[PDB]
Amino acid sequence: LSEEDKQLQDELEMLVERLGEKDTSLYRPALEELRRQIRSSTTSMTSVPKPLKFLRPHYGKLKEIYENMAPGENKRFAADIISVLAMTMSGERECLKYRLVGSQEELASWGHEYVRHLAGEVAKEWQELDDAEKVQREPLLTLVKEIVPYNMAHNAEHEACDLLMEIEQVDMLEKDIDENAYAKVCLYLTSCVNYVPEPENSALLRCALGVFRKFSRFPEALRLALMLNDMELVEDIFTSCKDVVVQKQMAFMLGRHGVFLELSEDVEEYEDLTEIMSNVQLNSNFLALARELDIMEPKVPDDIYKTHLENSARMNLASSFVNGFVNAAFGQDKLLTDDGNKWLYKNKDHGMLSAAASLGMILLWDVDGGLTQIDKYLYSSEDYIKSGALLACGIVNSGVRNECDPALALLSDYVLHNSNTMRLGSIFGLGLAYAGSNREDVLTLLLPVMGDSKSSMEVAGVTALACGMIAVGSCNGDVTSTILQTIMEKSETELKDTYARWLPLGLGLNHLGKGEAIEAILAALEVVSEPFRSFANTLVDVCAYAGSGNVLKVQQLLHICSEHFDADMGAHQGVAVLGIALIAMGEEIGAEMALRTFGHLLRYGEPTLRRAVPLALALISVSNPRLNILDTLSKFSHDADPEVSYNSIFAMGMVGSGTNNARLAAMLRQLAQYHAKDPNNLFMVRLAQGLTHLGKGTLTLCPYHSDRQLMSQVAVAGLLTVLVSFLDVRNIILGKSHYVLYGLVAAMQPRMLVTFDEELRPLPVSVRVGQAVDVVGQAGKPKTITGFQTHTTPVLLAHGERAELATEEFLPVTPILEGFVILRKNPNYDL
Amino acid sequence: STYSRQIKQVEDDIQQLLKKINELTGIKESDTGLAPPALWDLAADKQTLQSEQPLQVARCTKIINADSEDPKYIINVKQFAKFVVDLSDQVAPTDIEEGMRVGVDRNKYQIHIPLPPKIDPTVTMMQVEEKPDVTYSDVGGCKEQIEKLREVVETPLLHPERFVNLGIEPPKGVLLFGPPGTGKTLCARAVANRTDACFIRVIGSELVQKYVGEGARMVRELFEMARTKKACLIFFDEIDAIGGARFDDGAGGDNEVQRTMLELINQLDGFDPRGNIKVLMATNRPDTLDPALMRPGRLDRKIEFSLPDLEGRTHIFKIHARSMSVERDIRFELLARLCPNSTGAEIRSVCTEAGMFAIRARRKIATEKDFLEAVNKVIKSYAKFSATPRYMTYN
Numbered sequence A: 001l002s003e004e005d006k007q008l009q010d011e012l013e014m015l016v017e018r019l020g021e022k023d024t025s026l027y028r029p030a031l032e033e034l035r036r037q038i039r040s041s042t043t044s045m046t047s048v049p050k051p052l053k054f055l056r057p058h059y060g061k062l063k064e065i066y067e068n069m070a071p072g073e074n075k076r077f078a079a080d081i082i083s084v085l086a087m088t089m090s091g092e093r094e095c096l097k098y099r100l101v102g103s104q105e106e107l108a109s110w111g112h113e114y115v116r117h118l119a120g121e122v123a124k125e126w127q128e129l130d131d132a133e134k135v136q137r138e139p140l141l142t143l144v145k146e147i148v149p150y151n152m153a154h155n156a157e158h159e160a161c162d163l164l165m166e167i168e169q170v171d172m173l174e175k176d177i178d179e180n181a182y183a184k185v186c187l188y189l190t191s192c193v194n195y196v197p198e199p200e201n202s203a204l205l206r207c208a209l210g211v212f213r214k215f216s217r218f219p220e221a222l223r224l225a226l227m228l229n230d231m232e233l234v235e236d237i238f239t240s241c242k243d244v245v246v247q248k249q250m251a252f253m254l255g256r257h258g259v260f261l262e263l264s265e266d267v268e269e270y271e272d273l274t275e276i277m278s279n280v281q282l283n284s285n286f287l288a289l290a291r292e293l294d295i296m297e298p299k300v301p302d303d304i305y306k307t308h309l310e311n312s313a314r315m316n317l318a319s320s321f322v323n324g325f326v327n328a329a330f331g332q333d334k335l336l337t338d339d340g341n342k343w344l345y346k347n348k349d350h351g352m353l354s355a356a357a358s359l360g361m362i363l364l365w366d367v368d369g370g371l372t373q374i375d376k377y378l379y380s381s382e383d384y385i386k387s388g389a390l391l392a393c394g395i396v397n398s399g400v401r402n403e404c405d406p407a408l409a410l411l412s413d414y415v416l417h418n419s420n421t422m423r424l425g426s427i428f429g430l431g432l433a434y435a436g437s438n439r440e441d442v443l444t445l446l447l448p449v450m451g452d453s454k455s456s457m458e459v460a461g462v463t464a465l466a467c468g469m470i471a472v473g474s475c476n477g478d479v480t481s482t483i484l485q486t487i488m489e490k491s492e493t494e495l496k497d498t499y500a501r502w503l504p505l506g507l508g509l510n511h512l513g514k515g516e517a518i519e520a521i522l523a524a525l526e527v528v529s530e531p532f533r534s535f536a537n538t539l540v541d542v543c544a545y546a547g548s549g550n551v552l553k554v555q556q557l558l559h560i561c562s563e564h565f566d567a568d569m570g571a572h573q574g575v576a577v578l579g580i581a582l583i584a585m586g587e588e589i590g591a592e593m594a595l596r597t598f599g600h601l602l603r604y605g606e607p608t609l610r611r612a613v614p615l616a617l618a619l620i621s622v623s624n625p626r627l628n629i630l631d632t633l634s635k636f637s638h639d640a641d642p643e644v645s646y647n648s649i650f651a652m653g654m655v656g657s658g659t660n661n662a663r664l665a666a667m668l669r670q671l672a673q674y675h676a677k678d679p680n681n682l683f684m685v686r687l688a689q690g691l692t693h694l695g696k697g698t699l700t701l702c703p704y705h706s707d708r709q710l711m712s713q714v715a716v717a718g719l720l721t722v723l724v725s726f727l728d729v730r731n732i733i734l735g736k737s738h739y740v741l742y743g744l745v746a747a748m749q750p751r752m753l754v755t756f757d758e759e760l761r762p763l764p765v766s767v768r769v770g771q772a773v774d775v776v777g778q779a780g781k782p783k784t785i786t787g788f789q790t791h792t793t794p795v796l797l798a799h800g801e802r803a804e805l806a807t808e809e810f811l812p813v814t815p816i817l818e819g820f821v822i823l824r825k826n827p828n829y830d831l
Numbered sequence B: 001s002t003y004s005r006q007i008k009q010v011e012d013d014i015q016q017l018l019k020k021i022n023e024l025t026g027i028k029e030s031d032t033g034l035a036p037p038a039l040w041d042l043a044a045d046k047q048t049l050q051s052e053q054p055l056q057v058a059r060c061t062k063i064i065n066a067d068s069e070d071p072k073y074i075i076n077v078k079q080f081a082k083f084v085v086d087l088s089d090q091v092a093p094t095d096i097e098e099g100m101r102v103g104v105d106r107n108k109y110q111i112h113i114p115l116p117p118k119i120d121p122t123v124t125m126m127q128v129e130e131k132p133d134v135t136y137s138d139v140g141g142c143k144e145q146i147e148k149l150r151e152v153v154e155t156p157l158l159h160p161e162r163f164v165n166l167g168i169e170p171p172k173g174v175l176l177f178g179p180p181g182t183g184k185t186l187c188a189r190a191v192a193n194r195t196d197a198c199f200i201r202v203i204g205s206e207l208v209q210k211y212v213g214e215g216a217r218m219v220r221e222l223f224e225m226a227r228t229k230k231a232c233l234i235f236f237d238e239i240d241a242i243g244g245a246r247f248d249d250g251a252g253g254d255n256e257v258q259r260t261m262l263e264l265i266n267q268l269d270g271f272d273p274r275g276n277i278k279v280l281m282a283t284n285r286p287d288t289l290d291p292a293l294m295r296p297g298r299l300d301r302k303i304e305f306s307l308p309d310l311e312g313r314t315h316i317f318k319i320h321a322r323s324m325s326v327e328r329d330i331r332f333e334l335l336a337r338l339c340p341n342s343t344g345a346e347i348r349s350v351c352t353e354a355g356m357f358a359i360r361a362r363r364k365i366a367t368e369k370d371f372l373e374a375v376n377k378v379i380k381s382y383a384k385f386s387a388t389p390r391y392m393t394y395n
Ligand SMILES: Nc1ncnc2c1ncn2[C@@H]1O[C@H](COP(=O)(O)OP(=O)(O)OP(=O)(O)O)[C@@H](O)[C@H]1O
Pocket: B138, B139, B140, B141, B142, B178, B179, B180, B181, B182, B183, B184, B185, B186, B187, B282, B283, B284, B316, B319, B343, B344, B345, B346, B348
């Protein structure tokens, strides 16, 4: 027993004896010393007064002092000692009570560990407090107005955000945000929006948006608005900025997302602002890198096949896709940009449909020069070439918005042509040209096609895919009304056709990512008969929660996956597997849980259940060639079930789409030898090689940009269109409708990091490119890149790598160094 | 800390869940080489264990009465026995040739499947399966050397059409020689990264073996396995281990190793055509190589990796100081001038040591003084151990 410890053990009696005297003259010196006695051990975080822990039973003698008379100074310091003692035990409605009723001085005077205990109990009783207890939160709000400043003072800021989150009072955080800590709060809160459910999704997003707006950080404020899909806020965010240089860089992010904004002529620099967001200069900027990265030379499919190292209509059609995929958005090719009539007519039947359409994929984003080359094939007498070119119209404007549209002129008068093929190149092309536009003129021109009597199920589904792509994520009731109207008018027998599966997809795309906006639509779908109703409601429900991560929604999908049918009844089972990928794709943590579940579905699932797992792998990790998935897809490449075999090979190329993976290309080359005697399997093999070398390693199909936090509705629409169509790879892809692979054009974007000057000319500078590192939590300055290398700016960033400027000579407008970025010269540099 | 209690509750529930998940899922253990249960096709394995019968590996020796309709095959079943058997009904008579390995049954020993020729597992591992992380952009000061190396070992495989049309037979061998650290293996590593044909890496010390005739045997199986591919590359790093010139010192001095070189010489240019193999030899002692090995038809191109010049040394400095957090005004041209005859390896160490002086000083950016101190420490202080002065005489 230490004498100093015994000295405090004495105060359990003599100091209480001083507080046991009737006169108040001895009360204050004992209590004031007792109040300071706690602070004596509070100066050390680990040291606590153990004799004080023996004073807990002594509160009975002190019960009357802090309760039974005036609260001036007798109860003031008497209760606070109990509050510190209330820190040790459970402290249910005690630790807060003595602090609330006792001394109301500065909160940090009793210790950081005490308030941390106190702050936690503040949220605990807040949930307990009901509506009638609003007259109990008056001192509760006072503490949080002082707890929050204390937490940010000692860099314990992530604890502060936690206090307001539990009590649902994150509104008052912004008033106390300072210049030195704005970046930490928003980065912390934004990381939380992917796991908190509704309605706190928007609330945390708006509150994080408020901090950015107050601190004049517009470019990152616009990112939060886009994540919120608040078109009015996007208007308000854009026009509030008076720095046109920031506005020019902002227009790039809108163009990258595909969100168009109709500015007023009164806004300064109106011309260049519309050009930047319309991506009209994307073709020239993309060609500028190609000259800089000395990869402009065309690549024949033979250079991709590499058959000289290896120890038909389908073959010719396969190489048409490989030629288009490899030379996509380049404008030059040794096989079709030359005299391609020998090659174009080498294909047969619908092989010429995709071959003619593949010509526009080399000319992707080149609306002016691309339309200059298609015109030769537009007057072809053979029906496939013209409509294949008609679809090649939609590809050439895909991803670009023209002030007056060329594509509609070339495609308006062929949506109601008597020949079904000519329409087939019209609506599908028209969809790709204006995917993510919600424009009424095209939709009104495209709408009556679906209800046309001569419109076959093939074009009717194509119409649903197109109008769903134009109005993706818009909840346009006009497109919604007809999609239901066509669906229940159709007879039960023709609903067996797999081209009717595209109708719910068009409905689902129209409500892509909206969430709770489908119950009215789901109400209409009960009337539709089974098993299509099982298919239809699953497709739209999945599309409603796309990129949301809702664990509740994926709970029901596996419940569909739990009951296995001994095909016709289990048609909807494939979308359920595809559903897990579409919802969990939003953030990394949700996504790689899905791979573990995807393993069991490939193991315990039925053939139809396991025929969709590879597509889910492709959706969950498109253009992200991780080894775990690629090894997973490799094992089922040579599957006994033919559909799983084709689907896995396509997913392997889809997973490494545009990554130019040397290891993955070797597997496909080995797969080409193994599947050389299988025409069906070998067609997927060639397809994957083209996708692997998509755009010669300069194009991505990933729907997520802005550091994988902002989701592109257009890209998923093309992603969903191909992958849902791959549920019937035998009849759609391997059949006569392989043109649906051109839906991937809507998702084709460059993996770009181009630094432009304030006048928008190219500005090459040294940059560091490396794997992204999560920097939530740890204070100070943590590195956001690991295993990085230094390159000039015109470099391609594959999935998961960030970019930081190596030097400080230039100040980027956006913290996200992706896409087109404007650099401003640093005044501090060269001081 | 207010969530410390709630963290451990969900962490323990999670850890209990994986342990619970692994109970039903399985995959526990692996010491007997068991694959995860998701890959268990036990229905097919039971059929495989019955429908597919095991086959003993045997070598065909002589075909008796091949012309007639009753061709008898004499087989050598390794260490078991020798049998005169006939072909199975599911294999063509023309698919089995004398001297080739076959698969035979355990009942009547009839040949059931032709088999690949036996190849030493050590030789099989000598082929490169993961390409190195070195590109030609990582080699500085070797411009002319690199074009000569590519146009023999890379261009003919990539674009063979430009050689057959003009009746051109491209050289099938390159010797890279130079002092240590000049970039001989670095350029070879760049070749393997870019090449799409099969790349085999051979180290001369790997061809030295305990018993008599092994090194020649391994060379024979090396080229035998290389010939089973349309295009192949064999890299012989440190060929001087076995490529030394033949001599007679009374006793059997290096007689066994010379036979290994003679076999390698025979495969490169002998009675039989080599094939589509393009060999690549690297050595720092080319003066010791045998004259017959240093002859065109075996080593057609002699690319010399001399010490880089001022322009080359500046290029190497930029390559290695690309990712450094250097200052703005680092005079790399001055640094190249401070090390007149220095290998590229020394320049890399200068770059590494330059950042080491700054890391020692707790500085995040390396100044020009650090590079100046690095040159003194590497080029000057470590000049006692420099291999350049002795090895320029050998090259
Ligand atoms: N020309 C060069 N450009 C860039 N780095 C070089 C160059 N030459 C050498 N280096 C560097 O020096 C290192 C020396 O290893 P390297 O394999 O090139 O040596 P080498 O010439 O094969 O030597 P040795 O004769 O000892 O086998 C390389 O790993 C590389 O990092």
